[PDB]
Amino acid sequence: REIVHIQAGQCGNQIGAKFWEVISDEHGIDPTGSYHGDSDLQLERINVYYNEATGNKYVPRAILVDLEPGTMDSVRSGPFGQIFRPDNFVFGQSGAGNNWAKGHYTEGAELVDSVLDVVRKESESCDCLQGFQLTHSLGGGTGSGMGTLLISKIREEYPDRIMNTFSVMPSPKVSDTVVEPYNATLSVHQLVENTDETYCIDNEALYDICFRTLKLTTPTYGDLNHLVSATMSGVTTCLRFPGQLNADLRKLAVNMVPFPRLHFFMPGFAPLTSRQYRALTVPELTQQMFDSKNMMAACDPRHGRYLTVAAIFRGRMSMKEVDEQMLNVQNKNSSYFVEWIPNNVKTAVCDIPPRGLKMSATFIGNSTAIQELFKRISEQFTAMFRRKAFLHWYTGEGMDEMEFTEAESNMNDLVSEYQQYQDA
Amino acid sequence: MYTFVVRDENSSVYAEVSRLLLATGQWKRLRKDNPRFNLMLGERNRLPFGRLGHEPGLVQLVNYYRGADKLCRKASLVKLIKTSPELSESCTWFPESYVIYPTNTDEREVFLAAYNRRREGREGNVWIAKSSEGILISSEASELLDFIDEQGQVHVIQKYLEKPLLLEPGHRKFDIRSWVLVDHLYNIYLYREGVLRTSSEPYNSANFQDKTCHLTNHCIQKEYSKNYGRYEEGNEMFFEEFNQYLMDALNTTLENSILLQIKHIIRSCLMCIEPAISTKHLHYQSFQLFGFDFMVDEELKVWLIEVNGAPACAQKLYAELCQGIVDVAISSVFPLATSIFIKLHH
Amino acid sequence: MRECISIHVGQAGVQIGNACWELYCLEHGIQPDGQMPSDKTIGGGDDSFNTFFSETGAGKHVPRAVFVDLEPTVIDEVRTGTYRQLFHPEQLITGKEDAANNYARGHYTIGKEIIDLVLDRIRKLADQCTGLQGFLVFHSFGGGTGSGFTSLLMERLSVDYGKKSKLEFSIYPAPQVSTAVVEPYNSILTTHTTLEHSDCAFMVDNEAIYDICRRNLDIERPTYTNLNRLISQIVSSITASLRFDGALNVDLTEFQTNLVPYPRIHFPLATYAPVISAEKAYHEQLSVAEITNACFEPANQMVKCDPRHGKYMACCLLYRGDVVPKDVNAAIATIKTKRSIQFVDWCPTGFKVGINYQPPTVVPGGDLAKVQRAVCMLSNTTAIAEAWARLDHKFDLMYAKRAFVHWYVGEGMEEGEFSEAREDMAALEKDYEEVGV
Amino acid sequence: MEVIELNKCTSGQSFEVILKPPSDPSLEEIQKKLEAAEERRKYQEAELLKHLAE
Numbered sequence A: 001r002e003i004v005h006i007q008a009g010q011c012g013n014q015i016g017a018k019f020w021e022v023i024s025d026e027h028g029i030d031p032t033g034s035y036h037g038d039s040d041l042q043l044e045r046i047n048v049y050y051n052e053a054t055g056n057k058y059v060p061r062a063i064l065v066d067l068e069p070g071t072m073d074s075v076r077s078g079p080f081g082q083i084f085r086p087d088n089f090v091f092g093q094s095g096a097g098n099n100w101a102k103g104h105y106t107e108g109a110e111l112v113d114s115v116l117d118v119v120r121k122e123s124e125s126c127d128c129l130q131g132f133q134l135t136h137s138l139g140g141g142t143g144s145g146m147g148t149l150l151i152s153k154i155r156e157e158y159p160d161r162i163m164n165t166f167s168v169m170p171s172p173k174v175s176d177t178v179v180e181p182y183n184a185t186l187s188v189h190q191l192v193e194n195t196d197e198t199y200c201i202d203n204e205a206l207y208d209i210c211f212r213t214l215k216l217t218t219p220t221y222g223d224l225n226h227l228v229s230a231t232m233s234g235v236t237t238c239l240r241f242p243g244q245l246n247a248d249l250r251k252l253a254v255n256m257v258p259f260p261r262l263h264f265f266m267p268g269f270a271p272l273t274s275r276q277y278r279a280l281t282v283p284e285l286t287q288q289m290f291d292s293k294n295m296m297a298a299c300d301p302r303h304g305r306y307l308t309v310a311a312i313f314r315g316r317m318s319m320k321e322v323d324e325q326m327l328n329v330q331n332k333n334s335s336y337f338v339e340w341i342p343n344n345v346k347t348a349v350c351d352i353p354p355r356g357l358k359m360s361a362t363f364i365g366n367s368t369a370i371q372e373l374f375k376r377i378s379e380q381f382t383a384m385f386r387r388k389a390f391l392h393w394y395t396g397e398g399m400d401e402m403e404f405t406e407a408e409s410n411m412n413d414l415v416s417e418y419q420q421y422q423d424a
Numbered sequence B: 001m002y003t004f005v006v007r008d009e010n011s012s013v014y015a016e017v018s019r020l021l022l023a024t025g026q027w028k029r030l031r032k033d034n035p036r037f038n039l040m041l042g043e044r045n046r047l048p049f050g051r052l053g054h055e056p057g058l059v060q061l062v063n064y065y066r067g068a069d070k071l072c073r074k075a076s077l078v079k080l081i082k083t084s085p086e087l088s089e090s091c092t093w094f095p096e097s098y099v100i101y102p103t104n105t106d107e108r109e110v111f112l113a114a115y116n117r118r119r120e121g122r123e124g125n126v127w128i129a130k131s132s133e134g135i136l137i138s139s140e141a142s143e144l145l146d147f148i149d150e151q152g153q154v155h156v157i158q159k160y161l162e163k164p165l166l167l168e169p170g171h172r173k174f175d176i177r178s179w180v181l182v183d184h185l186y187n188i189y190l191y192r193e194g195v196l197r198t199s200s201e202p203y204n205s206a207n208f209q210d211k212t213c214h215l216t217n218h219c220i221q222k223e224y225s226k227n228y229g230r231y232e233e234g235n236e237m238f239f240e241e242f243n244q245y246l247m248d249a250l251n252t253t254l255e256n257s258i259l260l261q262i263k264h265i266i267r268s269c270l271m272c273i274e275p276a277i278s279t280k281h282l283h284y285q286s287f288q289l290f291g292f293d294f295m296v297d298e299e300l301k302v303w304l305i306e307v308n309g310a311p312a313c314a315q316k317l318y319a320e321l322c323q324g325i326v327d328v329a330i331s332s333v334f335p336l337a338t339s340i341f342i343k344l345h346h
Numbered sequence C: 001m002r003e004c005i006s007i008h009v010g011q012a013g014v015q016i017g018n019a020c021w022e023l024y025c026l027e028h029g030i031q032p033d034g035q036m037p038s039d040k041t042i043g044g045g046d047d048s049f050n051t052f053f054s055e056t057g058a059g060k061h062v063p064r065a066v067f068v069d070l071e072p073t074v075i076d077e078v079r080t081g082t083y084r085q086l087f088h089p090e091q092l093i094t095g096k097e098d099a100a101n102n103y104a105r106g107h108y109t110i111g112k113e114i115i116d117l118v119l120d121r122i123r124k125l126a127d128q129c130t131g132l133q134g135f136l137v138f139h140s141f142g143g144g145t146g147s148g149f150t151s152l153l154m155e156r157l158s159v160d161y162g163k164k165s166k167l168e169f170s171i172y173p174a175p176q177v178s179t180a181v182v183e184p185y186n187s188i189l190t191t192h193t194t195l196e197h198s199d200c201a202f203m204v205d206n207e208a209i210y211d212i213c214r215r216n217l218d219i220e221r222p223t224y225t226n227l228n229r230l231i232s233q234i235v236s237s238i239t240a241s242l243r244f245d246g247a248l249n250v251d252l253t254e255f256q257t258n259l260v261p262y263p264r265i266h267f268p269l270a271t272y273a274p275v276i277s278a279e280k281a282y283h284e285q286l287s288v289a290e291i292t293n294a295c296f297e298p299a300n301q302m303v304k305c306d307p308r309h310g311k312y313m314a315c316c317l318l319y320r321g322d323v324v325p326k327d328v329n330a331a332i333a334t335i336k337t338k339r340s341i342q343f344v345d346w347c348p349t350g351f352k353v354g355i356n357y358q359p360p361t362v363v364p365g366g367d368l369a370k371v372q373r374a375v376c377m378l379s380n381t382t383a384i385a386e387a388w389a390r391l392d393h394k395f396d397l398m399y400a401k402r403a404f405v406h407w408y409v410g411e412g413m414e415e416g417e418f419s420e421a422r423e424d425m426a427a428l429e430k431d432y433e434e435v436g437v
Numbered sequence D: 001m002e003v004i005e006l007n008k009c010t011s012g013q014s015f016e017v018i019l020k021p022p023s024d025p026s027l028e029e030i031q032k033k034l035e036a037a038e039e040r041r042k043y044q045e046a047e048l049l050k051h052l053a054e
């Protein structure tokens, strides 16, 4: 039932804050934590993401983490900043300098035990905790290094709860530093072992969507984070809203993950919106969603095959029509859905639409095409590693270059394991 | 855009129909084991009917009738005719037949009871032994019966048409093959083009042992026969020339002397098993192409020898029949964005 | 009078159990609070409805039922529902977290922690029975609880009540109605383990119920409530002879005796007619000949298959309403001459017929119109093996790649259990082939 | 086409019509299966924590 949410690092906290702003609006909770809605479907499964404090106040089950104080200081003064439990802000002062080793081994080690203190308090106040969700990026230091360090500690203490992450993949198109392939390659190693399901959010796909389709010539991180919080809202809808299908994290993982290491999902949303009035139809809503230009991992689905797909439609629409169109997309391109997992596309409907949209569709796909994403990261990694470039930042923190070779090998194996199922 | 699947690569008929579907742009062929198909050109043996009609959002159609084998295998056909009241123990158009199991119920006691009587009656008593090659004609029951004890398959022996219609020049036998399409509404469509399989050898009543004068099969004439292709190309005579010969020699027409009986025999057989194989209220739909084999005796009376379930067309006719299968059987269920068939109806 | 205890396991078993007991109360004139005015004996009974309803001094008639689900929510609605007062708290068992569509998680991991509690609550009902015939067990084939925990319960019921009959109502998975991707695994697993513990299993394909709800009730996307209300009428039709005065199928042993000549082949096909929408203003009432003929239309079977291409071992017609024996034989005589109904050689070709004069009860506000006569045909045909072939094929596709297997091994099951279970199904299909063709 | 064993009561009738004549593990074994799966789960958890200890 209950989910504990963790957001680590600058990117983790900026997409996490936007996530809570969006779903608090959907569930009718104002920045003070007071409910002010008109429907009661909102409050039926509110406990999944909110604790009810005394006085009919709903407080997110969220823990905010960073090695640098600045980003969370902006959260606390942001729109919904006062809605978070003040004790659940955990932060150091040193920063991680975009260094995975600092977040995972040195500065992050100094702070991880107090984060787990707060994780315990929130878990103990759970009727029947189902798992955790972590928002972070893979290309910096705190969210990727200390983030993955948090995952393995959490798994040690709760070995039988579901571990779920929204992971932002770095891209040179939207790059803060040159060491991002190093931090990503080291993180994917951790994620491939200690998470049950990871939503791959590629910053390159977000940038192309903001520019090629949304037509924004100069996108800001706010523009990208508009798409992420929209995506995050869609995938969690079945978890936090009453419907014919009441979903949980474990049934999601059991049905989406045919093999333990292949748990990296590419999400998709339609209609892609930029910060309209012409509502879509179920036909065009389905075609956009499955199109590449609507997907958040910068991969071509036609270059791989879908192992499993889970899809959800928001709004007042005919379920018979949603079935025809989903069955139509399958039966017309059945080449791209594997034949050894029968009925691998599932579809849900929730009549409560997202804010500003009459109808919307969200898409969770376990596709072999995701191997393109790890191929991209491994190539950028190798280009520098073959010359040992920028490595001193990491050996200065006690890492040996053998750990780099191991992380690169494990990712290449991952790419290879996706390749074999693309042919069978 | 429809989706179909092919599961018998050998059939020349349904290989050509697949090309035509693809040649409309609106049909794409899927892999063999992809279950999300509109149409299946399934295999001849052990076709999985139990898996059709369960895919959500798909109207599924297969090119075979489940249960049609009762008509298309020899022993079953004999038991189907003799035991169905809708065909009587004796229908005037099927030779007296008896199904008999080898050494390893059986009618061999019944056959000899009839065979002996005919021997005592002095009536000509030549019988033919067959199974679903290994073909034996003889005038004594014991010669045929020992012949089938070697075989491990259940055999059937029926009366031999000692007096056949013999085409002149040549004093030669023939068999007429008709192609019949039964669509999902169980309409029966006779193709207006048939074929005559001609023996290139004069008919001899003394030695039923030499094969060529008695067997009109194309392979039995292509290889084991002496002057294949002498009178007509490939020992195949078509209806237009057969009609001309009947007009010239017998002063009749193919339609009256033969084709009315052929239409009656096809209708009787297919209406007989209709309640057992019809897909009228089924969760999937079936059609099927049939090959009926007919014999014509000296009185211009038509006899049914065999019904074939996986038949092959004549090369010249292939284009016209395979196209007609699409329009009548396939596009009646899956439309795209004069008639070559005679409809047989009650 | 000998009692029957009903057991409802998992979401599908509990929700169908809700639909049935709602219908049983209407059929016996029992108010939602448990009062039955028609019963003239207060606090005690030897009547036929006492096989399903115990009696209390206050006049409350309580179902002899247990509802067990590892998740709390679906049973929490029985507790808050209209028939809440009908059920005793000790009858409604819940856990904290469900089996995640994982047979192994429901059979092993969570099954161990709650099996002894379910058996104590069941014995608490058996101890109020002067003579128990056995149990009716309602579950899904595809759910984690419905498949995993049921097969564990079936094993312990065979141990603890060895001389008792066990009947199954099982929901066969169908992708039209919300399914997991691993439901073929769970179906083959639970069948292999339960096959020797069930004496008769009535199998219900969700595809059949869904399709009847769209064709006959013209609901374009049915819900579980639509499905279950229809399933409840079929179940009620099958269990009516246990709850009403009659001479056919009066105890659980007779279902085995009349329907299951060979023990492993114990899956009768059920066919139900007529199903008419309540929205039909002008509707013409069907006759005995019509509804008995509809019993051989594949579109009215609980499992989609073709009985023409099989052999019958046993056939039982259960009529409800204005039916007379004379009209049944007339309808039978005409149908036999018009349909391909071939029995096996070692069985009498015949029909056990039961008529109950009370026409089917329907829930007020339901999609089912009330008719004057209806019939359920229970027939053991080898044609239902088509349902096993479909399922085994889906199982084979996934298992060839070991897809999703790690979830089952993760709960302590051994990969070999998959192959043992699959091999049992291969044996079962062969048994149908020997008898069938 | 005969009717046999016809019974009548107030609630209805039952009869037969013949058209043509004819031509387990114990408690402890279960406890052991369940306990065998439990140790396999425990053995897997220990290997994980051993890996997490490294």
Ligand SMILES: Nc1nc2c(ncn2[C@@H]2O[C@H](COP(=O)(O)OP(=O)(O)OP(=O)(O)O)[C@@H](O)[C@H]2O)c(=O)[nH]1
Pocket: C009, C010, C011, C012, C013, C015, C016, C069, C070, C071, C098, C099, C100, C101, C102, C106, C140, C141, C142, C143, C144, C145, C146, C147, C171, C172, C173, C174, C177, C178, C179, C180, C183, C206, C224, C227, C228, C231
């Ligand atoms: N006919 C019918 N089928 C149902 C119903 N509820 C669930 N199902 C079917 O049951 C299967 C899923 O099994 P469930 O009963 O929901 O699962 P469960 O037994 O609760 O086990 P877990 O949830 O995995 O712990 C699917 O095939 C559904 O189609 C119902 O109310 N009626």
Ligand SMILES: Nc1ncnc2c1ncn2[C@@H]1O[C@H](COP(=O)(O)OP(=O)(O)CP(=O)(O)O)[C@@H](O)[C@H]1O
Pocket: B095, B128, B130, B158, B159, B160, B161, B162, B173, B174, B175, B214, B215, B216, B217, B293, B295, B305, B306, B307, B308
């Ligand atoms: N009763 C009979 N009288 C005369 N000829 C007969 C006969 N039965 C069979 N034949 C001969 O057998 C030849 C073909 O064999 P038959 O039709 O019996 O089996 P077959 O396998 O060759 C055709 P199919 O593929 O339709 O089974 C015919 O051309 C005909 O000359």
Ligand SMILES: COc1c(Cl)cc([C@@H]2c3cc4c(cc3C[C@H]3C(=O)NC(=O)N23)OCCO4)cc1Cl
Pocket: A234, A235, A236, A237, A238, A239, A245, A246, A247, A248, A249, A251, A252, A255, A256, A308, A309, A310, A311, A312, A343, A344, A345, A346, A347, A348, C178, C179, C180, C181
């Ligand atoms: C946001 O939408 C979701 C979410 Cl969060 C979770 C699900 C999963 C799910 C996912 C599957 C699938 C089956 C199921 C079962 C289903 C259920 O009964 N409960 C549950 O949690 N389920 O089969 C193949 C592909 O994926 C589905 C959707 Cl649509």
Ligand SMILES: Nc1nc2c(ncn2[C@@H]2O[C@H](COP(=O)(O)OP(=O)(O)O)[C@@H](O)[C@H]2O)c(=O)[nH]1
Pocket: A008, A009, A010, A011, A012, A014, A015, A096, A097, A098, A099, A137, A138, A139, A140, A141, A142, A143, A144, A168, A169, A170, A171, A174, A175, A176, A177, A180, A203, A206, A221, A222, A224, A225, A228
């Ligand atoms: N989508 C998105 N990506 C971000 C955001 N902020 C930083 N990133 C990306 O994340 C990486 C840097 O990680 P960051 O969160 O700043 O590092 P950390 O705080 O030390 O964990 C780079 O690849 C950035 O492009 C954001 O708000 N949105």
Ligand SMILES: [Ca+2]
Pocket: C039, C040, C041, C042, C043, C044, C045, C046, C055
């Ligand atoms: Ca009483």
Ligand SMILES: [Cl-]
Pocket: C160, C161, C162, C163, C164
């Ligand atoms: Cl006992």
Ligand SMILES: [Mg+2]
Pocket: A010, A011, A140, A176
């Ligand atoms: Mg930063």
Ligand SMILES: [Mg+2]
Pocket: C010, C011, C071, C098, C099, C143, C145
């Ligand atoms: Mg459940």
